[PDB]
Amino acid sequence: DARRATWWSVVNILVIVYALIPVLWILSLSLKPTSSVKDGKLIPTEITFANYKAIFSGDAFTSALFNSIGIGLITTIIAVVIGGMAAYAVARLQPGKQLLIGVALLIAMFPHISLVTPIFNMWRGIGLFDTWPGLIIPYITFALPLAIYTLSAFFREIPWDLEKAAKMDGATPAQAFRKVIAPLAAPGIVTAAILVFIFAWNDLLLALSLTATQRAITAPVAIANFTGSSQFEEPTGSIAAGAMVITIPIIIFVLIF
Amino acid sequence: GIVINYYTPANEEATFKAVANRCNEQLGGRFQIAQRNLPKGADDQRLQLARRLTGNDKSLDVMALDVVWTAEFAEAGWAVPLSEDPAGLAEADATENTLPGPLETARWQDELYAAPITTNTQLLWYRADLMPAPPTTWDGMLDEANRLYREGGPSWIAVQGKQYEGMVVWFNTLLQSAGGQVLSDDGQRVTLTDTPEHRAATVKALRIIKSVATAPGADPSITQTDENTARLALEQGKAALEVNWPYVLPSLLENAVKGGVSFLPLDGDPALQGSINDVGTFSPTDEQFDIAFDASKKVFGFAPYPGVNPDEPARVTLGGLNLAVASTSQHKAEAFEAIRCLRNVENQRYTSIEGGLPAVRTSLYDDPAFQKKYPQYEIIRQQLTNAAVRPATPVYQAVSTRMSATLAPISDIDPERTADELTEAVQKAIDGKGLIP
Amino acid sequence: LAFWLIAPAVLLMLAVTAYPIGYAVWLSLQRYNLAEPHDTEFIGLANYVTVLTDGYWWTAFAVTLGITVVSVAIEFALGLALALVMHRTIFGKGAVRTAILIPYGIVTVAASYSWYYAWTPGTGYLANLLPEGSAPLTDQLPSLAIVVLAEVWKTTPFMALLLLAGLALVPQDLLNAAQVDGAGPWKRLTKVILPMIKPAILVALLFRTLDAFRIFDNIYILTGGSNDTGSVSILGYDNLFKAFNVGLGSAISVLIFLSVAIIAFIYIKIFGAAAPG
Amino acid sequence: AEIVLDRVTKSYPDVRAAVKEFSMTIADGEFIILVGPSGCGKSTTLNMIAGLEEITSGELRIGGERVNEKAPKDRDIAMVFQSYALYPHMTVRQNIAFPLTLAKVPKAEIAAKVEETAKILDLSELLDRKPGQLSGGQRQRVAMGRAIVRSPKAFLMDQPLSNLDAKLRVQMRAEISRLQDRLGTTTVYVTHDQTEAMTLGDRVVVMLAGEVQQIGTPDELYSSPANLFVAGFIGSPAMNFFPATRTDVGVRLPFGEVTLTPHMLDLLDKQARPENIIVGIRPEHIEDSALLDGYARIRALTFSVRADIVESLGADKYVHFTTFIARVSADSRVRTGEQIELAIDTTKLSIFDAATGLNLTRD
Amino acid sequence: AEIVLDRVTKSYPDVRAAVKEFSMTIADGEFIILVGPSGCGKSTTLNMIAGLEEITSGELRIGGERVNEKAPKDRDIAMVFQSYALYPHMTVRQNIAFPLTLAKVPKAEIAAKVEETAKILDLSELLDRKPGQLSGGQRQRVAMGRAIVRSPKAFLMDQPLSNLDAKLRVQMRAEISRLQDRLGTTTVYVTHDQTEAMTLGDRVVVMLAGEVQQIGTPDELYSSPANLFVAGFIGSPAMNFFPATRTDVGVRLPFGEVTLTPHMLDLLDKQARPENIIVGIRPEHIEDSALLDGYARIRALTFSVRADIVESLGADKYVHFTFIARVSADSRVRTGEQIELAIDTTKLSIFDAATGLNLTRD
């Protein structure tokens, strides 16, 4: 069946290279010596590792990963465990009113510049400025609306007959969920946790407005305010190496899944 | 223990980290200076400091704030008056050996709020193999660039062209060198057109900028050129004329002994090997220093800033860094001791010779070996006698943001229309009208 | 059950919206400057009548409108394509799904730097393809175009994964019946697949349209505020941390919060499909 | 448990009713078959009894107490759905054993009863394959099996055997009665295929338009139909019907006249005879009048007709006629286009009011 | 179009054949019922002909060409699935119309054919409800609606009338049989209801375990089954079977001897005589031996057994013995009573106890 299989393989390769090309462009810029970072050529030649060791001769990036993965995978769970209870309630019963959906939608927006404004004033008197007990609070408030609106708007649509059959065989609702809903909602719900981790680990705008010290300097802001360690040399290879080390937890996780 | 966090510009860290280490060996472990970074471009340094101050950051100890912000940070009470000094020594050490001009920028309404640590007037730089002597005037630069463009060489005139404080230092330098000024001496009144002579200066300055922005074979990236873009372009050999501050040298000789410079390869020379130490400090034996420097004079050179009018010495604008103790800090007396420590004369010497930043203590102009080791010293101190100042008001960063927004993108400037824009926009900034762009 | 089950979540949410957003509208009613911490006074609608009137606000608004509507239209259209080939895969078993995650998984700052260097003249692999003197980062409409392209590449898996989840429920019999009544791929896709998936597309496209409206990083790194352009998310940030006007910067926050809340209302009211029905 | 229903009623937007003041009773251990037209309200009555749907008005009593608002868990019913829904991921064993897992039974005993269910149901090999591999009647078998493992107070079933071949149907039908009797539990069956109803049904309920029409035994429903609709609705082919008029010894017909038995005349003397009578006869009572003996003749009427069409299913010729099928025995020599004479024992007739449809010969 | 199948085969992971090397020929405008047990190869075959499934081996020809690779649009057949799956996103008023919309039919022409179809299938009205409002006996008819709109190369109906009341079924069985005849279009159909199959079929194709068993007009399947399974599987109740031995004029039963007609005595000598033989008869051919006429009294064997159980069904009883006799309802027998039974020698059928084939097949 070559008429399908050749086309299908070409498209399967096309999406593979399209998902890689900018990541490979980062790796090539990272590995080119300072003589050839300016060469305008994608394929690297006469490779070096100088930029990586010039980052690792500094605690800044590791301490940024060390704290960022922490806040990211604390919030990706400790928000979602409350998000799931309210999402189940809003799917099963009527707190699922239009006003709860509208409020969750508005907060889903709560564009973070509009939230960091009032917050920054609060933390002039309240303090808690550089420690995690400042950053996580607006993070988790960004991580209940997603992990609520999407979470219910997906698993509430599971077929009624299977829910009737579970009720008729006499299951208690909160245990009927784990035995009959969760095992078949999972391929449509694994994405909710991934999208929240990809947000709670992966925003600059909060930390860029609400951190300064080494305390809680998260990996995105620790690149966005960074520029190459050699003040008298071209910064691009070091920024590229920085971007490269920043990708590592995500690409390792995607290769695990 | 006790730590004084010292904030300085990113691009001023290879000097400041190594001197903070020197000072920590001198203090005897009572307390330590720890160096920290603000952003590269000047306007982003103010942004990041104003956050740390406003958010009551307890870690912030001593600031290298830019020479132009002293009025704002004194008026807001964020930087201490020097009369806060727990030992009573600060106003004396601020006064005793500095210059009249550098020490005057630290005052707002008479009282000092800071102690100078660096000062800088910009210079013209040129490829000495591509032209015999640098032109004394902008029209001469346009001529040499237009000639080099016809001749097919690196004809870019590299200049600060991004919408940032840099772009405004240039405009103030042309206007003050043409004898005009942006604001009155009381800071109350806009002066680009209170009289036709100031307008004539203004439109001439704008027409110069427009001409160099539009000339055949000009840099297509000029509207995005930082000072770092300008320096690199010259280091990449793409520009034959460059207008920057007293820097370059550190990156030049460094990049040359790294072999990154096409016209000055020094990496291939066995006498210059090992010059760059493990932390990246240019540190040759002085015979190798002289070999590398003579090899530089053989191809590359520097000169006093170009005139607007023929036979007029240029009124170059001041730059610099002023230290102050931050109002939020716990370790006030230790921080005042640290400012007096970092301002010592051997660390000033070190700063200029190992880094490029011109020190502000005067006694080094009386040192012949310093006068050899920092070749540009004579023309810096000469230009400083003639220097223009940014217009001192607490309001200033609003004026810089509104004024620069009238000019970018540089190529579109009608001198009459944009003089009108400046007279409106600067008035609007003084009045505090509208959103800042 | 359900009025016990919302309690531990709403307990937090209600506080972290109510204090900040209420305090925002209070601050916007006042003259207030970060340099003069308690030395300025109540001012009514002064911040509104200024921020709604100046030219800069309407450009920074109109640009986020253009960028959101253009970037979502493309992100949607390519989102279906990535979803379909991830769902009906054959030769790309496992790998076809695995390669689709990383443009979501990368940090947006790193992506934006990569695009910035990709397009920078004389030092960018696709920049080298332009005729000489082009330098696209320096000009308004080209700078919009490259940030659209950067935003679109970064966002597409947001669409494609949600739309695949929305498609994966569709029972195969409905597609067999369409195929045996002879609806070719586009006929079924439009008469069966989209009408089945309606609610999940309007959810996905809503949260994208909001995200694409409040996006900041992808224009902050790629020439932030550079030669007009910019975005209302930048304009508000600047008027707060580099002009110290709390009165005006909060008024920008309120005026965008209302002007996005009507968009969140329109896809609930006009198109109907959302979480409750 | 007992079950009783008190004018239970259901209605929907258009509003229009779907069940209308229905009342009924089921003794503990009874076995009731619901039977009626397509679309008439069957599934909804069963769903409201099961608690999977909400009654509009009236009362439902289970155990003898009222249960209207009580949830499906509270009612202890096992149900098999009108479209037999299934859990698409669960392997067959678990798809069966699931209610035993809700009961938290010891796993060895769940697995044992999972084997007993598969054996009694003839789930052919307890196959443990995805439900997507057994489309057709294999799916319907698995869908029924979950119910018969539970053995609760009541079974509620909705055309449980529909997609089965005949050898499976009759085997399953016996398996249901064995299970029902061995447990002694109430069964409320539902079908519009009728021989399954008549052989199972210790009590058949006929319903039309959301309303009950007759409640009774297989014999009462066959032999004392309450009206011409139920008379025509029970059996196959439907009751042959004719207009008729009363004589002082019996009745006129489109081909002759019948001397009616004195017992039926006494019933026809209850109130009065209508201006037209619909007489009705089962097609399978009609036979070739050449075949009768004297004991049938004395109570026969005969007429000849041309055979409009003919078929045979073996046992019987289905021969068409018009003023109909005569479902005559295959012993008749008839072919289409021949004259043939049709007769029956008039003791077997039915008669009905041409206005209101009620049976006049009601025993 | 004609349809022809040669060696067509399907297999699945276990690989196990769902069907093994089926073959038949169907002329343009025939009518075929693919009757068979739950596991016998049916829906699977129907999905192969529709092209919704890979043919594992063999060849399919339609309309003068081989079509194994052509996609389901290309084949221009129509079907009603066993699941009768409707779209739940369109009122019935277009869910029936849907193929006419793909065919670019004019709006009023579509509406006319749709309301004519709606009257034809006795739909409640052109009900214009969402399918979630219907049940079974409405939903299944609506699914059949979109097939009977199309007039395709062929129809493939998978259990189409399985879910309807008997008074409506026979009306729909009239409507289908008129439609196939008026259209002149090849039709294939599947059901478990053999009584609905017999009245429709020009030809029946009884199938077991993925294998075709016998093909013909019902007459053959009822009167001349090829093996014991077909003989047991067709009819109701199932065929009675007894162990037997040959005589040179007849056969011995557990309760007597029956003289055979010379044709069977010739055929049973023309084939090799087996060491064990089984005799089969329909329950409806067994009757009260008191009720006979002279030729049956001459030709039959009579024996008596106890009616251990009894049931009634109008014209017939069932009575139980050790088996069922479907005796005529003129029999006055009660439960627990001895009764004499008889049958005609010509209606007995004879089967090999080893290979299972019918030696009384003609």
Ligand SMILES: Nc1ncnc2c1ncn2[C@@H]1O[C@H](COP(=O)(O)OP(=O)(O)OP(=O)(O)O)[C@@H](O)[C@H]1O
């Ligand atoms: N979900 C529903 N919403 C609205 N009305 C409904 C619904 N289900 C059934 N009805 C109404 O009830 C009637 C059919 O009821 P019901 O489902 O009991 O029929 P049924 O006899 O079970 O069907 P079948 O012929 O398959 O046995 C229809 O006339 C319809 O109008």
Ligand SMILES: Nc1ncnc2c1ncn2[C@@H]1O[C@H](COP(=O)(O)OP(=O)(O)OP(=O)(O)O)[C@@H](O)[C@H]1O
């Ligand atoms: N997708 C599949 N994967 C694996 N096995 C399958 C699949 N589809 C069918 N089978 C197997 O092949 C056989 C095919 O069943 P077939 O279609 O012949 O029965 P049917 O026509 O559905 O009978 P009925 O309609 O009377 O239930 C089934 O018994 C099933 O176990």
Ligand SMILES: OC[C@H]1O[C@H](O[C@H]2O[C@H](CO)[C@@H](O)[C@H](O)[C@H]2O)[C@H](O)[C@@H](O)[C@@H]1O
């Ligand atoms: O001289 C080196 C300094 O360069 C930057 O400062 C520049 O910023 C403005 C011009 O763009 C002026 O205030 C100043 O004169 C310029 O030099 C940099 O911010 C400084 O850290 C450097 O010391």
Ligand SMILES: [Mg+2]
């Ligand atoms: Mg029903």
Ligand SMILES: [Mg+2]
């Ligand atoms: Mg089937």
